[model samples]
Target: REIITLQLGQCGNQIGFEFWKQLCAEHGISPEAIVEEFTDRKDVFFYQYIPRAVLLRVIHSILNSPYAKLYGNNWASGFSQGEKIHEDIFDIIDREADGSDSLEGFVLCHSIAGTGSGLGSYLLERLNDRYPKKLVQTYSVFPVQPYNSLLTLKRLTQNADCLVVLDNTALNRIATDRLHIQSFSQINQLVSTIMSASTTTLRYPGYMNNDLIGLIASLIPTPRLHFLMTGYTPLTTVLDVMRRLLQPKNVMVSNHCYIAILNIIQGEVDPTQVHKSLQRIRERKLANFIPWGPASIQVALSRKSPYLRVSGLMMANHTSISSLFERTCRQYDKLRKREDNFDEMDTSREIVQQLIDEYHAATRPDYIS
Candidate 1:
């Protein structure tokens, strides 16, 4: 399916660029600067960049880096740097529109911290109003807990179809613990790796390839519960992937019971082996599937990349994700507990609390009815 990518701020641009780079490499496309061959599909991928001013300079310095080619002169920075950041963002979207038809969906990659304050919030607020029928999926990382993220997240509840919440603190801690140092490059690589693996079927279709809607629908049964936490496995070998589902750090969420689970397997896959692995997951209580509704795992065998060995990706929804909301609330409270709101900002603790409540309810069987 045709998907437009909105890269908001420097973090978004960097992660989005890496995502596309991985996609090209997996598709056997040339590693050259121009990717016309990759972009020339019946389904085209369009990019929109909104970089923060200081971050823009940082991005500029990386122009010669591996994934920098994808951002070539097609980006607009925030207010101090540009007069038409908003106009330019939509202008590219309009130009990439399929004649009179709308694209299938939009994948927004942005950080909810500093860079998202102006442009990211603005774009999210307008996406639904402009394209009421199109789906919008966000890939967001929350490193610093700013009061600002509360409002942006509230807006996402209304506008976005799915919100993939990647924890920067968790990822960084993982990287530091394992790699002995924290590196954005390593963090970015992990994010793109998981994202690309999940979308493998979409990029290279097989017999039961899933569309964007199908892949997300089960994980996000309701609107607010749409915030998802993911996990990847060798990161797993073809046989060991399922058995290691509950291994520590393998699952992004700290401790949680899931609502739904999806396993996208790559490499030399055997159907019987997949079934056995799945059965093991169910029998071993690897996850606690929602009881109110029917629960099942969606499995897809992605086209194997010649350069890589067998691996798998698992996208899950869980009730214990309340820790994320709890953490956000704790951080927001630290920033402004006595203050009603942050300097006339529309976001408030009550709003975020309401969101946390929705997540709590999603874990219950009655919430399904």
Candidate 2:
């Protein structure tokens, strides 16, 4: 049940740092760095060729943090540079492995744009080749509209067992709308909160305890339809939680139908309350389940501290996510039509179309067959 985490590039490392910090707090562990200091205040005797422990804060802070271990080094600001640092990346992965007998799976946190895209793609393909049986789930942040990156979308489809897609535009909108807070640190916390809630049961086991595979299996019925959208209820009434979860900004998809839905309810929740809330969702048509498949709302009650109030987390597979792919396609095609330096438009189109087709198939009842 130990899921190894990989945080690539600047975006990945920052978000991953906050993610581990929040997890540490939840588990009552300190995220403070375990420092091996190396400096004389006086500095009269200047040390030469001294190999100081000088571990980077990003790595040091989370290396000893609870739950997941961290890896990866710094990268420059742009995309092509990330294309060159594959060796160092793999070396970190090997060092962290430390000859373990087995690992559960990998949870990668990175953005879908910039160097993270290139590096994440490399790790995904490499990990798949290295450990075919292990699952590779990515908590990915997509850039705002009109900011296109071809390498990002191509690899996301081919790799990644399931993608927890976070739209920066939507996140910023909610942050501004709800709290008027726009700092990177605050936004990172929001993403980490959702991440923590999504895996609450795994972190704290319960009657319907689910591992990475089981949780993803309930949400994703197929390999191609692996993109996922999440909704979390922090502090609110039971029905209100469900209602907000159905809201567009809360769930990352606008007016879309879901192929599958998995709800994780934590903090002194009543089973009857969850039942009634779900009935309300259905009665009011708050969301739509797949037509061809069985109703996929799998609920789990988690064990948390008594002080914590009841909250819910919903992860779903929806069709309106095609807009993501459609935007990717338009940008990719425009690059080709303009005779830009990018290569293989045809292949990228096929990959994108495969995602679109999978979304379409998920909406049909025969997809279960």
Candidate 3:
């Protein structure tokens, strides 16, 4: 499955650049940052020149004329500008799409507001419309402008197949717990770490749950509850790692019971340890499940990464994530009552509120039929 990546704005590009470098070195690092040969699925996110990415919006890199009047922080302005340059953006996308043998889906790396999200929203809608069949998954780093974010939120809800939620606070907290850093670049490095860990199974296949759709199926039982949160733990025992994955301290967002969970384990491991951990979780009731469907901490093992000793990543659909959306709603209420698409805001907010309510429902014991 050939997955094309589009890094929007500076944040997207920064994380994308780091992600590219990590993928290269992990598969086979070169001091030159050049791609050599590899038997692994290098085609997953890379090309002959390197990664088959359609990275855009570095200002002067693409267009120099409007460098003066920057987008600053307006979603309307960024989206409008993207509309003007959509033809140019699509040129690169169409070319990348053609190069791939099987365009599995797209992975979006971006933050909020400015060009990062504003233009990110632009690319998403067009991608959904154009490549309707192909799955589009987003690696979203939230906390952007309210006005622009509300609009971006709607597109995210409407268009994207599933969104992988990343956070500055929670992500930084994760980085802090494991050899933590306090610098911008340092934090950005952690973002790349999470991105790469989440995709390990896709690149290095195993018995089952190897494809993008496989992951989607495990994590997303219902379409509307597709927004997911992830956590990463490197070089830990199987039992300890599994426990941390369910712990609120390890997750990148609010602490609530999980709707569904997928744990991707890399490197050699005792199958005994995996069984023991699953048993411990169930015995202690460390994780909660929805009554409407069958769910558990489904583990997907991966081939050993010669570059890494051992690492684990947890991608989960949790009800607590709705708290972020809830916060977004309150923030909009506070600001708009104090603030764009007018009717668009009204409609999308209902969607967000509806999503919040569903998350609440999923958490209840009465959710079962």
Candidate 4:
């Protein structure tokens, strides 16, 4: 399938593209592959309130020093700094539209804060202005505890093909301590806001662009791509909400398809309690169950041993998601293992096979290595 991704990252402030870059690297994908188009305007990349020179210096320190280590073990601050900043991020959308395959839709990669605010908003508005009839799609990330993010999620959900929400609230302590910033509560609110929006979207009518809708539809059956959400603590809370949204009973749109999720929760939690918490949500009709995958198990350990209660919650949630993946993979694998010719397969089956190939290559050992 032809696919294009529009990445409007959070710039300035404490959060850079560290998380975004790290995520791509681990997933065995290239930023350029996912990022097929970017805005052509070069002037939009500045932080006006701050001096350009000061910004450059800060970037230099991050790129050159060990200080950037906090983002991740392989944090590449210099690589992050090299990205172009912009005042109006929609220009990137226009640029992407210019070069993208009209058949394959676009992917929206945006963090909730920083340049993301202006960038994401501007693109949505621009789509209306230019291609009012044309709709784009994205899997947007909303960090936790944010009160304002709800409104944005609602607007974007109505416009994009599918919304893949990412929760960043669990990193509050580390993000706060490292940056000496005090917006932890706001971040948490933001995450909650997204969860609320997702649930609400389920209740209300959401107009996802046809292109994105088709893509999400095709990908679900293929079971190739996987999403890894790394962070402990409150991360499990976010996953629980996601499960709640994806549960067969709660799922209004489609339950046959689901993205692969890997969650790492830290702090004080245990597996049984975590399972119980999810069970409560399940009992409450929030989400469906998903079994574990070896990859997810590895990601769970990536966070070390989370605190007592936290680890358990994380493990429980992880177990659930992993289960889901296992089942879905098997269901999709049947098509691939078959010897049927392409023309004989139905549209969904054909698309699923393509997805399987693409997913395999995308996550192949050579790609990651």
Candidate 5:
């Protein structure tokens, strides 16, 4: 039930730092750099007293590094530089992986930058090679420079077992009202809230929805189709929260459809609320589940603070997410055609195309049957 976190680039590191901040507050880790034993799982994301995360800086803007320089958003330059650094990075990663008796997977966080540019791309490739069976999932902040995103999305499509998109208004609400954090760099705090809330089960290990694979398997059936969009909640009753999650405005991933959903509701709630809510949705002909698999809006309940009525996190795999890749491909095509491009760009474009095609396949009733 152990998971390792890898934060690449400045965007990743900022969010990773905040993630630990939220986690420490929840787990009672310490304010003066000490440890505490609690029922909530600590080692799941920590090692002894430190985090089980490894932060890699390919650009080095946030800290000092003699090797630091901008790659000018060049994917090849970042990737090539990553080639020189992979040995040492993997030494650290391998040690962390070995530290766990049952390390389930790695959760990566990043935005498109020198790191995600090609350095992160390189890490995904190496992780695939190094641990063929371990699941790799990324909390991605969808972005651009067109070419950079094209390559990043391509690897995320091909390499990860699942993905969680951190683009939404839910986090905005969390950062401002709930966490009581001042409004701005709140983007990072919002990301951490979702990360921590989404993984609450894993951290608490309540016997159900506690393992990464277990939490993921239901949402991701065929492996490649796991780009999940999320919605945070606390508005009202279970039905209100369920109804709120399905709307497109809060969707974050602007797709016109959905595949399957996993709703993780914590705090307090009625025990039978899920069945009632699921029944309420089926009345609308609800989220379209693919014929290739038996799917539904799965609800996993949890125990948490008493006074709060309820707080929910919804993770879903929706077919409309393909539109993101299609849009990205369009951007990449416009840019590369303007410059005539490299062989690497063509392969990246092809991989992006494949993922788009696969999502389209899910929409077809006979797709995988």
Candidate 6:
């Protein structure tokens, strides 16, 4: 009865909830059985409070999770912070849960890019010091340019304890837009929407992936599990903002995706007005190279009068103090060289980029006609 808390980044909270909701339904237990813990603070916009917890969950799951066999540098710490995060994850599991008499250990999960890098790793090491011999696993959803589900499926099926799987397909599409437009506001909106969407988009063995489910059912007795999801969508595209503003009507033809804002204001205000204002901001700033979409747009609007409150929602979608995490393990049977194993990392990275490209296509003007 180890207690596990899976946290998520900005848009991950909604995704985690949806995941647990489904798991709980199948198990006939309350979702609380597997808690979804994340940061809910507006002030701590940039601090990753529970990074160690996140790392531990990833390491434990990666080592313990089932998979074929990854090729290349089995685990490539591409980013400097990557090493730190991995170390911390190992340390936490080692220290906290290894030799405990009771099975009630707790693990927290999180994502790294949106927040700080080393914070998650640092804490994980401290926990590993507490528990020495426990199993370790990791699931890293890299922000890249294409879609790859091989690893995602492996991680989800292996654990059966705290499963976390996310396809950056949607997010990869959104990130590509950011490189072109450089608008944090627009990117933020897209990140929120896509993260929420990715959280819900997963294949379960018995429930969603019935074949995988059958495999797990035969291997182990029914096990209690909880899955947590987090999101990071680079909403920085120029054309995206223009299109969101005009083609949808009212605004001009600029490119910017605002699903996050749309979700919040869907009932509160008229969608047309939101789109119009977004378009104006995009066109005005296009010449200057200064990106302004939602966050700053709301600030500028507030200066004139208090028509609506967009600050709270915007901030929540952007920052947080603490979060939950999950492990992702993928197998690759083609690792002739250590370098070849690194393909898993590359695979995940590409998926994120694909998400961005998709957003660009979705917001392309005139397709609606």
Tell me each candidate's RMSD, in Å, in order.
5.1, 8.5, 4.6, 19.4, 4.9, 17.9
Best by lDDT: 3
- Model 5 has an lDDT value of 0.73
Error of 5 at 162 (Å): 1.3
Tens digits of per-residue lDDT, candidate 1, 115-166, equal 4544666676667768887888888877634555665666666678888888
Candidate 6 Cα misplacement greater than 4 A, ranges: 1-72, 75-91, 97-152, 162-165, 175-369
Q: How big is the positional error of residue 10 in model 6, measured in Å on the Cα after superposition?
A: 18
Q: Following a full C-alpha superposition, what root-mean-square deviation does model 6 have from the true structure?
A: 17.9
Model 6 scores worst on lDDT over the 10 consecutive residues at 315-324
- Give me the overall lDDT of model 4: 0.36
- List the candidates' TM-scores in order: 0.84, 0.80, 0.89, 0.33, 0.86, 0.25
* Model 6 lDDT per residue over 1-369, tens place: 233333433323323333333333333233223322221111111112211122213233334433101101111232245454555545544454443333333333334333322333333444355444333232233331111223332233233233333334434344464445424344444444433323221221112312222222322222322222332222223333333432222110114333121111212233346556567666675312112222222211111011211211121111110011111111222322233465654654344333333334433443232
Q: Cα lDDT of all candidates, in order?
A: 0.66, 0.64, 0.76, 0.36, 0.73, 0.30
Model 6 vs. true fold: TM: 0.25
Superior by TM-score: candidate 2 or candidate 3: 3
lDDT tens per residue, model 3, 1-369 = 788887788888778777876776787746354544554676677666455766575445423432222116788778889899988878878987886788898888888757667788888888887988889898888753776777778889878998988768776666677755646678878788888888887777678866889889877887888898887755257888787666667677742477788888875777668887888789988767776567777887887656546668888887777778777788888987774346877887888887778778877667653
Which parts of model 2 are misplaced by more than 4 Å? Answer: 32-88, 144-148, 235-237, 254-256, 305-308, 339-342, 365-369
Over 1-369, each residue of candidate 4 has an lDDT whose tens digit, in order, gives 233344444332223333323333323234442322211111111111111111213455455644343221111222233233433343544554454435244445655434454446555655555665453555455441121243243345345544453544433544465445666344544333223222121122224222334324432322233232222232245445335433333211112122343333333334455555545654675433222222211112112211103331111122122332233345445535663353422443444444444434443334342
Per-residue lDDT of 91 in model 6: 58
For model 2, how does the per-residue alpha-carbon lDDT over 1-369 read when each residue is reduced to its tens digit?
346676765678777667655554554223332322221111110112111111214565445556232222221233345446657656766764543345567788887665566566666767888877878888888772223344556677877788888888777877887879747777787888888777777756566654677787777776778888888756255777778767766775433467787777775655677778878877888767767657657767776633226677888877888887677777766665664543444565677777777776666767755
- Top candidate when judged by TM-score against the true structure: 3
Candidate 3: give the clashing pairs: 336-339
